[PDB]
From a paper:
In contrast to the PenL-WT structure, in which every residue could be mapped, PenL-tTR10 and PenL-tTR11 both had a highly disordered region, where the mapping of the residues was not feasible due to high mobility. In PenL-tTR10, two additional residues flanking the first unit on either side were not mapped. In both PenL-tTR10 and PenL-tTR11, it appeared that the α10 helix structure (13 residues: 183–195) downstream of (in the case of PenL-tTR10) or overlapping (in the case of PenL-tTR11) the tTR required the second repeat unit of the tTR, instead of the first unit, to be in place in the protein backbone. In the PenL-tTR structures, perturbations in the omega loop resulted in the dislocation of a number of nearby residues, along with the disorganization of the α-helix in the omega loop (Glu166-Asn170), which most notably led to the breakage of a salt bridge that is normally present between Thr167 and Arg104 and tightly packs the active-site cavity. In PenL-tTR10, the side chain of Asn170 exhibited a particularly large movement of 9.63 Å, causing it to swing 180° from the active site cavity. Furthermore, the side chain of Asp240 was rotated approximately 90°, moving away from the active site by 3.21 Å in PenL-tTR10 and by 2.89 Å in PenL-tTR11. The side chain of Tyr105, which is known to be involved in substrate recognition and the stabilization of the enzyme-substrate complex, was flipped and moved away from the active site by 1.17 Å in tTR10 and by 1.00 Å in tTR11. The volume of the active site in PenL-tTR10 was 274.9 Å3, as measured with CASTp29. This is much larger than that of PenL-WT, which was 182.3 Å3, demonstrating the extreme expansion of the active sites in the mutant enzyme. In PenL-tTR10, the interaction between W1 and the general base Glu166 remained, although the geometry was altered.
In class A β-lactamases, a conserved structural element called the omega loop5 constitutes a wall at the active site that shapes the binding cavity. PenL (NCBI reference sequence: YP_439646.1) is highly conserved in pathogenic Burkholderia species, including Burkholderia pseudomallei, Burkholderia mallei, and Burkholderia cenocepacia. PenL has been used as a model in exploring various evolutionary paths to substrate spectrum extension through amino acid substitutions, deletions, and duplications. In this study, we demonstrate the extensive perturbation-absorbing capacity of the omega loop against TR mutations of various sizes, some of which are large enough to include the entire omega loop.
Residue numbers in the entry: 22 to 172, 184 to 248, 250 to 262, 264 to 301
The structure:
Amino acid sequence: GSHMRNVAAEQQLRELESTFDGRLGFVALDTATGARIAHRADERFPFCSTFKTMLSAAVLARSAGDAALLQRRIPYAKRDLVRYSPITEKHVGAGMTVAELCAATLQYSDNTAANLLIALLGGPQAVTAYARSIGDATFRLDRRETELNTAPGDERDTTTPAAMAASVRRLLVGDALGTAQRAQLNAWMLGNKTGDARIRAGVPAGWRVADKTGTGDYGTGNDIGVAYPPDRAPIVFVVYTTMRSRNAQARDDVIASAARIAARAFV
């Protein structure tokens, strides 16, 4: 890639933002060189379900020091379910293992799974403390599902594109987790089912993508992750978007277009 391509990409992100009534927060990192393409990198955005990556990392970190944490089965009843639990609703009673809950929350964005894992760790303060432990002093999880998602300069349940990009890089590509835990987190996110129209839609079909989406009111549309091209270094993608109108729908097309801008600039 080149400096001039990265500068041009940043201009294209400004132009993309001008096409809708909202804000675009974006960071892409080419791990070959540390080159960054950024837009509103240090502004806060509501993270919505993208926090589930940090949550699952925190669980994996706990598992490194515990016997068989990932195999613990956590029982719950139908009356413990919160809104949007497509996987956990199928296993009420005996429940699901911690590993299965991580998979459910990452791949389907399952909210009961998230809340079960938040409780396991000791609450939202524990997830935030985990973030601090990996060098992220920007991320703040204040609430649980589904309150954190009702999304405005309310700094609760926000992070910045830059903070989240550094965290995603350290977790999925770097050494924030042990070698084996990194492989597991990647494996789960590479199987995400909710992101086909977002980062995945903006990069070549021949790239592997590990991603986690977030969606909320004010047309909040997010996607974070790493793309793995076949014969080059991984590229980190962090996309946050939110709109001025509370009624607005999220914009998959915008998210895909932002990822495409960086993909073309780095390839």
